[PDB]
């Protein structure tokens, strides 16, 4: 038989910067909200779930200095947490 | 140590990962075992472009993004300087991978110039705007047209501006 | 002196459902989103932070009937968690 | 009891409040002292209409999320069938309110029929669109246009459908 099923569900969008706001990228370093994601990941992927992991990323942003960029967590539709549980 | 296969990602012990299978009930998505999986990820990143000025330092992010989700357990495919419509036909045929089927996740990660309206193709300019929407993305690994990832967490990463804003507003302390 | 601040930061929006997809409600009952959120508020905001909540609420609606729908998290730019911390 | 100022809604306990303030490090929104706090939240519900069909029932969500966030400790205002122009107007008054000044935070709930593209107000019609978008909402409560609410959790709830699909795709089991 057939059953129903959601077209939209368990996604997680994470962007570099609010809605209408710049992005910032070094020549050398590479963009900032890649280099702060990888970080965390590496930190946090054991321990944090990937929706409370972007929120770190976030709080690491929270003081704006000269290349201020908050970057945004979009159209979620997680129902459950993701946990990466790195080296299983 | 970061010789391993998840480098410098920190590991989740045993205890660790039983604590949280504890901690929270059947509110956890569900891992498929190891030996079997085949995780897949894309990157799609621009870099060089027509009328717009070059992404330098995009190698970096290339690196860091692939090596770190290779260290997650992705097969990771990678590709670079797309028009929208590259980027379409190439997410159209990551959508239909086999793959995905013996998955258990996904990752997206999109990286070049961006505006309001969405991600910036290699031909992109004002004249002639190559513009690829996130509704697009959204829509292309939806259970409509990427049943496989059913039930299945799909993250979207995109490295992009969003408009010309400096995103900042002055107060008085 | 003057400093900066981000444009937009500390905002959560929680929609009804996805992006070009129904919402549902009953001409007694209420809507049944609004319902639903406010059994988990009650129930949750305890202890839970608001954004977990909003997880839940989603994984309430996880199983399609003949009126599916899945609640949305948008645009999200909280930097630490929001706890409600009710009685206090 | 439910017959308390917060009603239904189960009570965190002081030891559950100091387990959450252990548990997260400083990664909690700061919570304002509950004698001298002026919370604020404001209800828009659209129920009658010039051209779209009554949306019955919507007494018991007005109802109900008032009761909620009273319990929860905000002073909440309902506002009732007001065109786009008028909800704009009344969310810039509300972000104009002096008691965001001593406020931690605020609740935003907008009740209507709702389109792709955003809110129905009383007199939508395909003809004459009158629509409220979401963008224009966060624009408004902003740290530009709100900048009382700087640093502070703004809590957006939008019950409207946004678009006409079912939302569902069918798979074989
Ligand atoms: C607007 C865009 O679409 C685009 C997005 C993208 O390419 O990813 N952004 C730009 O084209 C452009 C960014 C280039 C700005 C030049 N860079 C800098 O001024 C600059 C200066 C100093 C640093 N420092 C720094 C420190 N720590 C780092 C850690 C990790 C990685 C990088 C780090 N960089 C960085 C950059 C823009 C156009 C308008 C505004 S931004
Ligand atoms: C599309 C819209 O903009 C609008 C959104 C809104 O008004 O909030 N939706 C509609 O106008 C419209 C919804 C009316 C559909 C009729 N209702 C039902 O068929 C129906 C049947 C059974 C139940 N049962 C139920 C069970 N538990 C509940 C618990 C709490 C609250 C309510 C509960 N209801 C509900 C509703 C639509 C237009 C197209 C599709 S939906």
Redesign the pocket.
């Known amino acids: 038989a057939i059953k129903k099923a959601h077209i939209e569900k368990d996604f997680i969008a994470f962007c570099?910067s609010t809605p209408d706001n710049?992005?910032?990228?070094?020549?050398t370093?590479?963009?900032?909200f890649?280099?702060?994601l990888i970080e965390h990941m590496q930190e946090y992927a054991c321990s944090c779930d990937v929706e409370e992991i972007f929120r770190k990323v976030r709080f690491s942003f929270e003081q704006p200095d000269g290349?201020a960029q908050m970057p945004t967590t979009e159209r979620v539709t997680l129902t459950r947490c993701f946990y990466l549980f790195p080296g299983h | 140590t970061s010789s391993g296969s998840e480098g410098n990602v920190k590991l989740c012990s045993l205890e660790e990962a039983q604590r949280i299978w504890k901690q929270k009930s059947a509110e956890i998505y569900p891992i498929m075992d190891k030996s079997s999986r085949t995780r897949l990820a894309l990157i799609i990143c621009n870099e060089e472009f027509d009328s717009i000025?070059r992404?330098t330092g995009?190698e970096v992010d290339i690196t860091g993004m692939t090596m770190l989700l290779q260290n997650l357990g992705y097969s990771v495919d990678v590709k670079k300087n797309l028009t929208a419509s590259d980027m379409t036909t190439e997410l159209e045929a990551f959508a239909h991978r086999p793959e995905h089927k013996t998955s258990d996740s996904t990752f997206l990660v999109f990286?070049?110039?961006?505006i309001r309206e969405g991600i910036?193709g290699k031909k992109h300019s004002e004249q002639v705007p190559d513009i690829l929407q996130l509704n697009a993305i959204f829509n292309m690994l939806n259970t409509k047209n990427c049943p496989s990832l059913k039930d299945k967490p799909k993250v979207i990463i995109i490295?992009?501006?969003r408009g010309?804003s400096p995103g900042v507003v002055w107060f008085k302390d």
Do not use: K, L, N
């Open positions: 570099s710049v992005s910032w990228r070094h020549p370093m590479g963009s900032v890649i280099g702060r290349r | 000025p992404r995009a990286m070049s110039h961006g910036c490295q992009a501006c010309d």
